[PDB]
Design a protein around this ligand. Structure first.
Ligand SMILES: OC[C@H]1O[C@H](O[C@H]2[C@H](O)[C@@H](O)[C@@H](O[C@H]3[C@H](O)[C@@H](O)[C@@H](O)O[C@@H]3CO)O[C@@H]2CO)[C@H](O)[C@@H](O)[C@@H]1O
Ligand SMILES: OC[C@H]1O[C@H](O[C@H]2[C@H](O)[C@@H](O)[C@@H](O)O[C@@H]2CO)[C@H](O)[C@@H](O)[C@@H]1O
Ligand SMILES: OC[C@H]1O[C@H](O[C@H]2[C@H](O)[C@@H](O)[C@@H](O)O[C@@H]2CO)[C@H](O)[C@@H](O)[C@@H]1O
Length: 587
C-alpha cells in the first residue's frame, strides 16, 4: 500500500513506549543530514537530527514532548552544502503568511462517502454547479474581511442550497501565498489555506455542505508546480520533484505517489466528492508534442480513484481537441468522467454577443454543439475565466439597452439549462453582476438591495431553472445518449427560433423553444412527437423575472396538421428574447 504517503510521511502523533510525541518523516535521498526545528527545540537544529533510510531516502525521528499546535520546520544541509529551512511538504496545516512554518496536526478522522452523494455524481443525475472563489464571494462590511470557513458554512451553504444547486465547486483551497493566483500557484498541497481558519474549520464547512445535501468539487492543481518561496524546488539540493518552466516529474515513482496521495487525501480525509483538473493541455504538451509521462499520470490517477474511491469523480478542462478526455483509458484514455465544454461556451457567447439582427447568419453557433455532444461527457460552464481581464461580465456581453441585455441573458440561461450536459455557473452570474469578477473584493451584492429589480429577476430564474431542471428526468437523465435530445426545428435561421425536445428513459419529452430576436412570434406552428395537452413549466419572459409576461397563458392542445415532417403540431406564442419549456399533461 504505497498510495497514501500522507499516512506515513510528514508529522504524525505517536507514542514510543509510554512517552508520546510526534514522529517526523520526510524524503530527501541526497540531502546531507536533516534535523527537525520546532517550538519544542527553542528552534535549535543541533538538538534533533534525523536518521536516514537508504532504500526509501526518508529521514525519520520520533520526538517526544512535541505536541499538536506547535510550529516546526526542517533544517537540512543540501547536496550543494547549504543551510536551508524547508517547509514540510506534507504539512496538513500551515501558518498565516508570512509565511511557512508547518504545524503539528495529524490526520482528520476520515469520511466514508455516502450512497446519496455517490448518486449525485452519476451520469444520470442533474448536476448543477455553483463555482465560488472563497476569498471574493462575500466580505464583512465594516472591515472588508474574509468570511471564515464557519461563516461560509452559515452563509454560502444555505444560499447555494436554496438557489437549488447540487454541487458547490471551490477554486483551489491549497495553501497559496498570493491572493492573485486565485489558488492556482500553490505552495502547500496538503494544507487548506489558513486564510479562512483552521483545517478543522474547513472540514466543518464541507460537513455542512453535505448536511445540506450538496456535493463538493475541489479545484485540484497537480499541474501547476509550486514556484514561490522556494517551497518545493530543489528540495534536497537536487531536482527531486521537478525537471532539468518548472514542471513535476510525474515519472519518478515518489512524485507520483505524492500527487495521487493528495487526491486520495482530499476525498478521504475531507469527504470531497469530486476533483477538477484545470489547464490539462499544458500538462500534456511540450516524443511527439505530447508529454507521454504526464498522460500516463492522469490515466493512472483516474484508474486509482476509480478503484480506491469509487463514487468520487474527476472532471477536466482541456483546451485543445485532445480525443477522449472523458473516455476510458483502455481506449482513448485520460479517463476523466467529465469535460468542460469550452467550445460551447465560446460559440453560444459569440451568438449572444451579436446584434439580434445578425443572428440569422450564425445559427450554426447554437446547433453545432449537438454534433460533438456524444464524443465527451460535457459540462456547460460559465466560469470565472470568462469574466476577468477585460472579457466583461456575462450580462455586459449582451446587446441593446439594459432591458434587452437582461432579456438576452434570461433567454440564454433558459437555453443553457435545457441543452445536453451538466451545468456550471460562477458566483455573481446568477444575479447578473455588471462588473467583472474581482478576487480582491466582495461580489456586487449591493445590486440586490432595495426594491425588487432586474437582478432579483435573474436570481429567481436561476433558482427556478435549477429546481425545474432537477424535477424532470428528461432535462437530465440522458444528456449523453442521442435518445435524450431531438430537434423539432433546427432550420429557422431567418427568425432565429430554435426548438428541441428532451427525453427521459421512459420516453417522456419536454419541448424547449427559444426565440432569439425581439420580434414576438404568434401562431408559430411546429411538428411534435407526443400529441395532446401541453403547458408551460418555464418561461424566461415571466413578469416574475421582470419579463413582459407574454406566453401561452394556459394549456395548448396539439393539432392534427402536418408540420416539419410530423403528423401533429403545436401552434404557440413564442415571447421575444425568451425561451420556454413545455410539458405534456396526462389525461
Ligand atoms: O461542421 C460540420 C457541419 O456543420 C454544419 O452543419 C450544421 C447543419 O447544417 C444543421 O442542420 C445542424 O445539423 C443538425 C442536424 O440537422 C440534426 O438533424 C441533428 O442530427 O444534428 C445537428 C444538430 O446540431 O447543425 C450543424 C452544425 O451547425 C455545417 O453547416 C455543415 O456543412 C457541416 O457538415
Ligand atoms: O460515456 C463515456 C464513457 O465514460 C465512462 O467511463 C468512465 C469510467 O466510468 C471511469 O472509470 C473513468 O475511467 O472515466 C471513464 C471515462 O473517461 C463510462 O463507464 C463508459 O461506458 C462510457 O463509454
Ligand atoms: O460582501 C457583502 C456585502 O456586499 C455588498 O457590498 C459590497 C459591494 O457590493 C462591492 O461592490 C464591494 O464594494 O464590497 C462591498 C462589501 O465589502 C452589499 O452592499 C453589502 O450589504 C454586503 O454585506
Amino acid at each position: 500500500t504505497h498510495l497514501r504517503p500522507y499516512e506515513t510521511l510528514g508529522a504524525h502523533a505517536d507514542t514510543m513506549d509510554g512517552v508520546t510525541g510526534t514522529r517526523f518523516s520526510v524524503w530527501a535521498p541526497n540531502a546531507r543530514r536533516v534535523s527537525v526545528v520546532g517550538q519544542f527545540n527553542y528552534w535549535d537544529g543541533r538538538r534533533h537530527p534525523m536518521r536516514l533510510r537508504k532504500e526509501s531516502g526518508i529521514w525519520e525521528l520520533f520526538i517526544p514532548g512535541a505536541h499538536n499546535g506547535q510550529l516546526y520546520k526542517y533544517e537540512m544541509i543540501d547536496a550543494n552544502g547549504n543551510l536551508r529551512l524547508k517547509s514540510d511538504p506534507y504539512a496538513f496545516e500551515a501558518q498565516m503568511r508570512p509565511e511557512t512554518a508547518s504545524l503539528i496536526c495529524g490526520l482528520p478522522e476520515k469520511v466514508v462517502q455516502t450512497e446519496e452523494r455517490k448518486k449525485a455524481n452519476q451520469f444520470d443525475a442533474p448536476i448543477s454547479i455553483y463555482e465560488v472563489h472563497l476569498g471574493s464571494w462575500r466580505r464583512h462590511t465594516d472591515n472588508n474581511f474574509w468570511l471564515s470557513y464557519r461563516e461560509l458554512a452559515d452563509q454560502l451553504v444555505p444560499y447555494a442550497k436554496w438557489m437549488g444547486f447540487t454541487h458547490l465547486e471551490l477554486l483551489p483551497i491549497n495553501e497559496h501565498p498570493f491572493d492573485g493566483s486565485w489558488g492556482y500557484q500553490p505552495t502547500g498541497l496538503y494544507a487548506p489555506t489558513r486564510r479562512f481558519g483552521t483545517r478543522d474549520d474547513f472540514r466543518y464547512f464541507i460537513d455542512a455542505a453535505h448536511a445540506a445535501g450538496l456535493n463538493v468539487i475541489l479545484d485540484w492543481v497537480p499541474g501547476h508546480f509550486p514556484t514561490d518561496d522556494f517551497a518545493l524546488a530543489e528540495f534536497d539540493g537536487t531536482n527531486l520533484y521537478e525537471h532539468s518552466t518548472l514542471i513535476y516529474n510525474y515519472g519518478r515513482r515518489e512524485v507520483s505517489n505524492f500527487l495521487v496521495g493528495n487526491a486520495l487525501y482530499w476525498i478521504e480525509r475531507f469527504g470531497i466528492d469530486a476533483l477538477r483538473v484545470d489547464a490539462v493541455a499544458s500538462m500534456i504538451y511540450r516524443g511527439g508534442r505530447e508529454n507521454l509521462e504526464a498522460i500516463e499520470f492522469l490515466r493512472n490517477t483516474n484508474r486509482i480513484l476509480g478503484e480506491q474511491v469509487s463514487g468520487a469523480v474527476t472532471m477536466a478542462e482541456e483546451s485543445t481537441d485532445f480525443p477522449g478526455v472523458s473516455r476510458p483509458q483502455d481506449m482513448g484514455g485520460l479517463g476523466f468522467w467529465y469535460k468542460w465544454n469550452l467550445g460551447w461556451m465560446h460559440d453560444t457567447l459569440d451568438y449572444m454577443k451579436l446584434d439580434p439582427v445578425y443572428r440569422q447568419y450564425h445559427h450554426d453557433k447554437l446547433t453545432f454543439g449537438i454534433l460533438y455532444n456524444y464524443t465527451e461527457n460535457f459540462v456547460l460552464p460559465l466560469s470565472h475565466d470568462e469574466v476577468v481581464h477585460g472579457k466583461k461580465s456575462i450580462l455586459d456581453r449582451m446587446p441593446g439597452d439594459a432591458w434587452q441585455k437582461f432579456a438576452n441573458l434570461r433567454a440564454y440561461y433558459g437555453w443553457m439549462w435545457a441543452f445536453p450536459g451538466k451545468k456550471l455557473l460562477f458566483m455573481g452570474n446568477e444575479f447578473a453582476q455588471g462588473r467583472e469578477w474581482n478576487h480582491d473584493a466582495s461580489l456586487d451584492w449591493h445590486l440586490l438591495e432595495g426594491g425588487d429589480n432586474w437582478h432579483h429577476g435573474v436570481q429567481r430564474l436561476v433558482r427556478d431553472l435549477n429546481l425545474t431542471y432537477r424535477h424532470h428526468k428528461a432535462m437530465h437523465e440522458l444528456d449523453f445518449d442521442p435518445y435524450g435530445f431531438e430537434w423539432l426545428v433546427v432550420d429557422d435561421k431567418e427568425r432565429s427560433v430554435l426548438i428541441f425536445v428532451r427525453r427521459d428513459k421512459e420516453g417522456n419529452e419536454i419541448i424547449v423553444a427559444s426565440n432569439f430576436t425581439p420580434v414576438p412570434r404568434h401562431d408559430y406552428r411546429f411538428g411534435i412527437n407526443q400529441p395532446g395537452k401541453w403547458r408551460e413549466i418555464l418561461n424566461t419572459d415571466s413578469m416574475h423575472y421582470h419579463g413582459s409576461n407574454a406566453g401561452n397563458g394556459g394549456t395548448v392542445h396539439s393539432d392534427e396538421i402536418a408540420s416539419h415532417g410530423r403528423q401533429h403540431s403545436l401552434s404557440l406564442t413564442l415571447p421575444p428574447l425568451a425561451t420556454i419549456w413545455l410539458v405534456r399533461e396526462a389525461e
